[PDB]
């Protein structure tokens, strides 16, 4: 448990040091892909429950 | 609204995050 904690604390600091491992273009690709899929299905977003949803 | 901008980040990591996530 202590060894895995020392590994996790090391890899999180390595992520904070080396920056994000994802590029911007792949993020734009998956974002526009999700946009095209959700606009293809006419998905209505989940609203916040205002005062009394009665469920 | 008013995007998240994780507690954490250093200077250059904030710069890279603002570059690739905006």
């Amino acid at each position: 448990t202590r060894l895995y904690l020392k590994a996790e604390q090391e890899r999180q600091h390595n992520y904070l040091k080396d920056g994000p491992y994802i590029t911007a273009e792949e993020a734009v690709a998956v974002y526009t892909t999700t946009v095209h899929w959700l606009e293809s299905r006419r998905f209505s977003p989940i609203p916040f429950p205002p005062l009394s949803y009665k469920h | 609204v008013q995007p998240f901008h994780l507690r954490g980040m250093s200077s250059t990591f904030s710069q890279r995050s603002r570059d690739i996530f905006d």
């Binding site: 202590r2 904690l5 999180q12 994802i22 998956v30 892909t33 959700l38 998905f43 977003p45 916040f48 | -």
Partner: protein, 111 residues
């Protein structure tokens, strides 16, 4: 139950249009695989941007904000910034939506 999933998968393999005919050199391929390190390689900012399309933005900020917290084991404290906290309550949603984003990459939009 998962054995009924296996039974319906076998029935779906059986009920295709001429699935076992190999007189003209056709082939059947069965791929099975696992997404390696699916739980540890979710960036939280990308998760928030993909999560703001389906819910209210305060809900997505609450779902992203819980993942950025300090994990403790009896002497050891470290903050979490990469990968989701898999033991949350609502985390069962997060794996099932993010993996949906994988289906648009593997299967393609048309199929």
């Amino acid at each position: 139950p998962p054995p009924l999933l296996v039974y319906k998968w076998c029935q779906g393999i059986n009920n295709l249009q001429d699935v076992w005919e190999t007189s003209e050199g056709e082939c059947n391929v069965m791929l099975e695989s696992r997404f390696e390190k699916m739980y540890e390689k979710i960036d939280l900012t990308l998760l928030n941007r993909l999560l703001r399309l389906i819910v209210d933005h305060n809900i997505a900020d609450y779902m992203t904000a819980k993942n950025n917290v300090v994990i403790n084991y009896k002497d050891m404290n470290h903050t979490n910034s990469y990968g989701i906290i898999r033991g949350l309550q609502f985390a069962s949603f997060i794996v099932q939506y993010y993996g949906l984003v994988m289906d648009l990459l593997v299967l393609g939009l048309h199929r």
